[PDB]
């Protein structure tokens, strides 16, 4: 067959919640380990602290998931997004599209038009 690429990971299902628990930590660790390496690959002018902050928030939005089959789709997406980033397939515009650098009240929203 054709060779899987450098960070290609075989798609496998989580055995139990302990499996998923350990994989999510492995994925979060691997992301924040790579933040210094992302910065010089993509010439990020922000410091690495901001990059790791964004990694933390992406993981935090899936914090309250209690379904193995939703976590494994999520562990799939991060694996592909990690592989995509580390092999430098995406470019600076894609990585900067990921950093964003709604009205806070009804009355603020009303006065400007909806938002």
């Amino acid at each position: 067959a054709v060779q899987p690429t450098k960070f290609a990971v075989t798609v496998r299902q989580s055995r139990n919640w302990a499996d998923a628990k350990q994989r999510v930590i492995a994925a979060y660790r691997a992301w924040i380990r790579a933040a210094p390496e992302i910065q010089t690959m993509y010439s990020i002018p922000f410091p690495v602290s901001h990059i790791r902050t964004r990694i933390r928030q992406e993981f935090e939005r899936h914090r309250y998931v209690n379904k193995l089959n939703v976590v494994d789709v999520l562990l799939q997406q991060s694996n592909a997004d990690f592989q995509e980033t580390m092999n430098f397939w995406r470019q600076q515009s894609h990585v900067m599209a990921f950093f964003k650098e709604l009205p806070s009240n009804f009355i603020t929203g009303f006065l400007e038009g909806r938002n």
Binding site: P36, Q39, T40, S43, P45, P47, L111, E112, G113
Partner: protein, 337 residues
């Protein structure tokens, strides 16, 4: 800021906000927009769906501006300063006129007095003639009709001419600007800028050009900014020596300069400017400004009056100077020293 803007002549503007396909409702004219500042004001106005007239001289140097806006949004008009008709044809559909026309050095057909006083005279007289709502003229820092530097004097007299003709002029005084394609950071990283009269010890409060284009955008929406005078300067004071220190730390090159005595350099600089056709950075008055120091004239509004807090030049050295790092040090992270 709202969905309704009401102008000085009283016309309402019912706006749809986002994107280049929407309705910004404002028809602007930006004189001097093919320079360095001019793109940032034009991109800001155009990408929010406003019609922008761009008076130009050389056809091929205006072309980057059309990408800013949708179809029919950015209108190019070919004009000359001494062609009053082309000036009048360019401002008469407009509710705001930006005057960004300036030149650091004299030319064989324009003195500093001719491009600043007379150019502003025609532009402002057309603003008065067709009753355009807003007129944001951009002067320089240290502008003074009593000055002796031709730059700071002539841009100081055009300030008074504009008010005398159109009193609601928003007068904007930026400090020396840094940014992409700036004549501040890119010259200190260059190799042509070797001559110098002082020891690069003149001080100023450098300001991001990106934050000045944003400031000019906010003056259009804050109608109360009309008839005011704005000095737009940065958060810190530096010398040319402190700025050049940052550049060397970033490009990793350790640039050097040849200092000359002003009674010697100034005559030569007036010869290079008179014998070469390109902007050489050297001229009799640019040497005179070289020995002058920036003063923030009080009773003048600031970035805070637009509700904006400028960022320091140090945070921007990596972004803009990285093209000038040698291959050995290029892969390194930003200095952040």
């Amino acid at each position: 800021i709202s969905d309704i803007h009401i102008t000085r002549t009283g016309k309402p503007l019912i706006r749809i906000q986002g994107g280049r396909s929407s309705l910004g409702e404002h028809t602007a004219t930006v004189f001097g927009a093919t320079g360095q500042l001019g793109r940032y004001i034009v991109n800001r106005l155009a990408r929010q769906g406003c019609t922008v007239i761009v008076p130009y001289r050389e056809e091929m140097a205006k072309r980057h501006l059309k990408v800013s806006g949708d179809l029919g949004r950015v209108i190019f008009m070919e004009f000359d300063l001494r062609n009053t008709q082309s000036i009048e044809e360019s401002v008469r559909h407009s509710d705001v006129v930006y005057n960004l026309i300036g030149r650091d050095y004299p030319t064989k057909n324009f003195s500093l007095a001719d491009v600043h006083i007379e150019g502003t005279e025609r532009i402002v007289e057309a603003v008065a003639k067709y009753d355009v709502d807003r007129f944001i003229q951009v002067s320089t820092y240290n502008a003074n009709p009593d000055s002796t530097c031709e730059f700071f004097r002539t841009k100081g007299i055009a300030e008074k001419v504009a008010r005398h003709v159109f009193p609601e002029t928003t007068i904007v005084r930026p400090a020396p600007m840094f940014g992409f394609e700036d004549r501040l950071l890119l010259k200190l990283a260059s190799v042509t800028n070797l001559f110098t009269s002082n020891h690069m010890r003149e001080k100023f409060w450098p300001v991001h050009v990106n934050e000045v284009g944003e400031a000019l955008e906010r003056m259009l929406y804050d109608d109360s900014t009309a008839g005011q005078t704005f000095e737009l300067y940065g958060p810190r004071q530096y010398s040319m020596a402190q700025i050049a220190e940052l550049v060397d730390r970033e490009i990793y090159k350790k640039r050097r300069h040849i200092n000359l005595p002003k009674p010697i350099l100034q005559p030569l600089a007036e010869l290079i400017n008179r014998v070469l056709w390109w902007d050489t950075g050297l001229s009799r008055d640019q040497v005179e400004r070289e020995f002058h120091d920036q003063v923030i004239d009080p009773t003048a509004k600031t970035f805070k009056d637009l509700g904006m807090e400028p960022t320091d030049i140090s945070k921007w050295t990596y972004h803009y100077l990285l093209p000038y790092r040698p291959s050995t040090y290029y892969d390194l992270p930003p200095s952040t020293e």
